[PDB]
Amino acid sequence: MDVLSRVFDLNNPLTASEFRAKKAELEAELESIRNGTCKTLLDLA
Amino acid sequence: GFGKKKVSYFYDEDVGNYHYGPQHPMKPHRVRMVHNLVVNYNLYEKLNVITPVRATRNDMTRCHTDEYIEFLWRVTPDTMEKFQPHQLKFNVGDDCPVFDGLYEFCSISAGGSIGAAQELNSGNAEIAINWAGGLHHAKKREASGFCYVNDIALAALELLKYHQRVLYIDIDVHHGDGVEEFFYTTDRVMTCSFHKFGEYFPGTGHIKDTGIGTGKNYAVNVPLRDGIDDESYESVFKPVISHIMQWFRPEAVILQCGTDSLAGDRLGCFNLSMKGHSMCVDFVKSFNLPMICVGGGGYTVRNVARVWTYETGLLAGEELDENLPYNDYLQYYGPDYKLNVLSNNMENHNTRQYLDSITSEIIENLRNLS
Amino acid sequence: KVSYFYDEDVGNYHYGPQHPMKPHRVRMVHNLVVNYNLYEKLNVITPVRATRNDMTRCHTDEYIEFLWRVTPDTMEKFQPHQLKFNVGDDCPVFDGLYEFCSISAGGSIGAAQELNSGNAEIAINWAGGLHHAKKREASGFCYVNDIALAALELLKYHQRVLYIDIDVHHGDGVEEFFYTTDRVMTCSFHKFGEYFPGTGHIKDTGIGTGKNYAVNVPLRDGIDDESYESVFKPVISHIMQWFRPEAVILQCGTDSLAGDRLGCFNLSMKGHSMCVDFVKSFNLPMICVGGGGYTVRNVARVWTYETGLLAGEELDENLPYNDYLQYYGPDYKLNVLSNNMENHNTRQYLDSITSEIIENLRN
Amino acid sequence: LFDKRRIRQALLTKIATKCFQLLNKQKSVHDPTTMSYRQSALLQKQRIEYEAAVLCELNSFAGFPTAPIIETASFDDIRNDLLEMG
Amino acid sequence: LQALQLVEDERYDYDRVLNTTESAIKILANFCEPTIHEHLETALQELERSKRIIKNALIIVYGKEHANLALDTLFKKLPTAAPVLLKRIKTKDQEWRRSKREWSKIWRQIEKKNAQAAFDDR
Amino acid sequence: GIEIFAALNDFTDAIVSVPESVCGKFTSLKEIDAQVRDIRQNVIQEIGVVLKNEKNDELSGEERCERLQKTLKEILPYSDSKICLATDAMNNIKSCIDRLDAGFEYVELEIPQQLRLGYPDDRALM
Amino acid sequence: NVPIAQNKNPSELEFLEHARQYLANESKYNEFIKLLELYSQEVFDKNALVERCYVFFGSNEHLMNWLKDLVKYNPANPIPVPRPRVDLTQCKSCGPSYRLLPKIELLLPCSGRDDLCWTILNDAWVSFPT
Amino acid sequence: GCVGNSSGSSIDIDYYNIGNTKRGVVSHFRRRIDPEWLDHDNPYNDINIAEIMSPLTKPQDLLTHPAISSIFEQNYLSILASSALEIISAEHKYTAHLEQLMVALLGDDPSLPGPPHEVFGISPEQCRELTITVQEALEKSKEFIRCWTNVRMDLLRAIRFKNKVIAYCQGEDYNGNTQV
Ligand SMILES: [K+]
Ligand SMILES: [K+]
Ligand SMILES: [K+]
Ligand SMILES: [K+]
Ligand SMILES: [Zn+2]
Ligand SMILES: [Zn+2]
Fold it and tell me: What sign does the CA torsion over B192, B194, B196, B198 have?
């Protein structure tokens, strides 16, 4: 068990395209977990 | 779809196996017994039984001190010849002995209580039980009176992340002094305790102990006398709590359900029965608030097992048959073999005028509120 | 169920460097309404800005178009035409003037439209009620006269309107608007003598078919709560007996309190709120607008109290911590007191004017 | 079943906060804005101590001082700003 | 009575200024980001709708002569004029707030003394 | 030598600076929060009737959810306002509290011991 | 010990001077000084200081052994040996059962508390059976 | 027409240049030594600027100095923190219900093993729209709480420091209470 201790464990600025890339990554990961295909969800499951 | 809500119920199968001392009145074994009945009444089909996540050091020092928790986590019954200063400082050795698995026991208790708090915070439940918790005599700097880590404080802190007011009702025969000392100077937790005030342990709880600082009028003591019965208790219990719910207006309740206030206990000196004791639980439940119900005292294990079983079946919304089904400890429950604890013919000392006086006083105090 | 109009922008306007009139005061009022949790007992609305076709039913199109085109940094071509419309000295030109005029007039017309359609009985527009502006010129801090527009709106359904005025100055724009008609009756309680605007004589009671249908109550210095009550209740009662109004526009100017910048009365919050109580007690459709008021701490407190009392609630005496709290030191209470200023109304005078009025009202 | 739903909820929140925090961190690091704490402290105390003397003298001699005036930026700074904007 | 009225006028004058600089700071800081060059015709539309607040902020921080200059120059060279304005306005805001604190230290004493002794118009 | 209390004199300015930012933001919130409460109670009742599915059974499950959908669509523009205000307030108070904390780190150093630990005899120590 | 405010014992003076220039960051230099203060007034012991020092002087192994030799550290017995207990008979009371605690007693570390445990939980008044 | 004259010749301001900044002044109430003017004619009499603006120099002075003591007697943090808790609690009562509906719609509900569209009969094309909107709502409501909690916790940090200082600068007058 012990979910909270396994699910839980920059001022340098960013250009426009690096920012867009990072944002796209994070949104894609969110949509990945919202439908059950994350690579961190499946390992703990 | 998600249907009714069930009662969460925290249990850890190792908890029965910890043994304080040779003839010590406190036996964790009793929780085992309770479970052996909850299984054999087929109650477990109306609950959600959950295994607690043992609590760590960084979770117990949210209330206690680093030195106290360190001493807990380091001592063993063999190497306590090197800790003789710490025994004096931390009040450990005679009534609160050092035994095997002390720290593991404390982690199980505190983990159940924090888990219940998280259950209510999350919305998964509206009632949550943990009979191994409820050690209400433990101070921030010391151990006191059979208790080592005060888990009701940790439950309350975790409750105060989203609820603005909390109420802690205490019906163990003693004064819940740790849980009062913790929240004595604050107006977010109101404590209310009914106890035998006299030449009695711990010695505190006087009716004019009602808080300092901002917590002025946010502690309530009801000092009674020997042999009180079920109807006297009800007469002094229902008005106080009705007005606390009216005027304080909490959002979450923590109910301590000690059972040395029952007739025939090893230490207590009251005269309630199973129905008299359960009246409090049913009345508190009737208000429809998030609720936690923890254990407490209780030193005649047959009575305690039967009463906590009855109250569990009563929180779940069921109605248990009064014949005990065959379980592993049937021979503790002689000779009636029934789900019932009976009062006696000891003499009551709480005259009607006394109870009227204290009820009036307390209700004025509570009228000071908002 | 009280309609309460409030536009968030009106508190951002600014008359001039040291001008006495600050629309910011209205914002302060709201900042105490929110923190007094009256936001939930009131039907709070946002006024629909009045168009230009809405504003030229009273005023002229030339004056309104001048108001439209003018601008504080391009008035080198208007500077000749400035004082033809009385604009410039105590009615200055500032940035965003037409917006402010549209906000206030729109609040008033919206309140009238709420009352017409039964959606409420009491409406509140604390940032309107500018009674001095005339049909073809600004006058004494007011550019467009919204109250005439509110009444012109009310008269579509109702049949006889009553306009009560307890600003220490005379309500000359309104009185001159409806001076020759019987369907609206104006009543003013004003200091008279060597004072602005210098009209308001006890023998000025309308012309034509408006004869007897105006009421000027010329008071004097230092008047206080009891004398004001003694002259306020008889006349109001006889007006409601004999005129039989259907709609009531109550102008709640607050420069008639004790300590004002430009006032010479001695009322207090109780003495001022008595008038709102007494006019409310007749159970009528009632618009309740603002007006004067130049010591803004007093204005804020009094108008908050009158709103909490028009809704039906009972606000605390202490003040809830808000953003403009330090304006109200060193006591921090919702009370406005009075001083030992010496009254100048001898009882015989008050009774003489009261009897003259009431004998006029018998027709 | 318990632990499965718990994990899903925790991960959902964690990733959403990461997203919001990245957005805010970009907006704030793009925002344009010493030598110690001791230095700024001593500077403020010296400045207050000078102003008190100035105002007590001006009080005795001329009148009672009103609130500090709200003035524009310097000529030099207006110049540099119109430059870098130009 | 007039000393109290002066206290109130002074704090009002501080307030209108601080509020104007606040709103302009908000808008301009919104216009400063990495991806601003991308979607510019939308930001250029939230600037026409708020030209007055920024005009007043400029009138306060620069003067009535440079105000038009800065307004135009920012209407053209937006995604690199916005940051310098933001820096200037934030510096001014900080110093004015610091000043208002220390003078409110004194307004309170004025109000105490004269509030007592000002209810006597005899 | 003898010490001025520069840190203790800046502490008292920070302690005043703290409430004002959040004051404005708190009021701006209370407005929004008060013009949304009816819709939130609506949503709570709706979720309750949809999730129990056995206590208020007067519906057609296809429509009982179209109502919840519309109601959720109504509340959406308020959450954005709340998020903007919360982020503004967070930033302001963050800067102010960084200042106050950096100060208190020092005000505890230039203060005599007897003023925070008591005289070496006003300590019980049995 | 290190019981004087800021001046004695050239050994300790040199060690303090050299303790910077690695801990050159002052924000995390005042913390170490406050911990030394707590140690010298008998809140800690020589065994409980060493652990937070490990938090500061993990890598710089020259400084850490100097420290250990400065407080007479003994690796034979590392148990921390807490501060003796107070007797509340000689303490101001408020009511029948509560007593006020010495000022120093509020300086025991509780290293799990955020700033909600520090404002809600009661710290100063203890309970004493009357 | 002249509504009035607001500016009297007693608040008129005179500017004096000191160093690099000009400071206005009210110069009608100067010393102007004469027979007619008494001291108590001056509104700003007995308003000592030299002791209002003066520093502390002594910790205990925190409790007697006029302006500073007037500062440590305001309780504006204790009001704001309680207001923050009152605001967080209603939002959370709403978020808990949104979250329950979410674990139902995703399917991770122990008491609902079947497919969610079945358990409340709706087309499987309606369940997806419902799930999308519920997801947006839940995420925004969680973010607001995460921010407001940081606001509140920093207010509490301020309160904690303030009380600690009030208790330090009391020496031997320390009775547990610290309400100035
Ligand atoms: K009890
Ligand atoms: K309490
Ligand atoms: K008429
Ligand atoms: K009038
Ligand atoms: Zn007990
Ligand atoms: Zn007027």
Answer: positive
- Asked if C107 contacts C30 with a C-beta cutoff of 8 angstroms, the reply is no
Look up residue F38 and give its two tokens. 């009816």
Beta bridge partners of B167: B190, B253
Cα distances from F63 to residues E113, F50, H126, in angstroms, run 68, 11, 10
By Cβ distance, the residue of F23, F30, F37 closest to C34 is F30
Question: Which value in Å is the resolution of this experimental model?
Answer: 3.2
Amino acid at F103: G
Q: Which residues does B256 contact at the CB level (< 8 Å), separation at least 6?
A: B134, B136, B152, B168, B169, B170, B171, B172, B176, B294, B295, B296
Residue B265, in any domain of the structure: yes
**How many angstroms is it from B150 CA to the middle of ligand 5?**
14
Measured in angstroms, the CA of C30 and the nearest CA of chain F are apart by 10
Full domain range(s) for residue B348: 7-368
User: Does E25 touch chain D if contact means CB atoms closer than 8 Å?
Assistant: no
Q: Does residue G29 sit in helix, strand or coil?
A: coil
Breaks (C-N over 2.5 A) in chain E follow: none
Please, where are the H alpha helices in C243-346?
Answer: 269-280, 296-311
Q: CA triplet C206, C208, C212: central angle to 5 degrees?
A: 40
Which residues from chain F sit within 8 angstroms of residue D40, using beta carbons? 10
Residue B2 lies in a domain: no
Residue B101 backbone zone (phi > 0: left; psi -120 to 50: alpha; other: beta): left
Residue B340 lies in a domain: yes
Residue B174 C-alpha to ligand 5 middle, in angstroms?
Answer: 5
What CATH number does the domain containing B128 carry? 3.40.800.20
Number of C-beta neighbours around residue F90 at 10 A: 19
Alpha-carbon distance of E86 to E68, in angstroms, equals: 17
| CB distance F103 to F11 below 8 Å | yes
CB-based contacts of F30, cutoff 8 Å, min separation 6: C34, C35, C39, H87
Element (H, E) at H143: helix H126-168
CA nearest neighbour of F26 among F94, F113, F106, F86: F86
Which residues of chain E make contact with H66, given a CB cutoff of 8 A?
109
Q: Residue H153: helix, strand or coil by DSSP?
A: helix
Q: How far is CA G84 from the centre of its chain?
A: 14
Structure tokens at C102: 């549209």
For residue B1, is it within any domain? no
Pairing state between β C2-5 and B7-10: unpaired
C132 is catalytic: yes
For residue B161, the SS3 value is: coil
Instruction: Using alpha carbons, select from B284, B180, B269 the residue that is nearest to residue B228.
Output: B269
Q: Ligand 5 centroid vs B180 CA: distance in angstroms?
A: 14
Tally of structural domains, chain C: 1
Selected for mutation to probe chain A from E32, E33, E35, E38 (highest A CB count within 10 Å) is E35
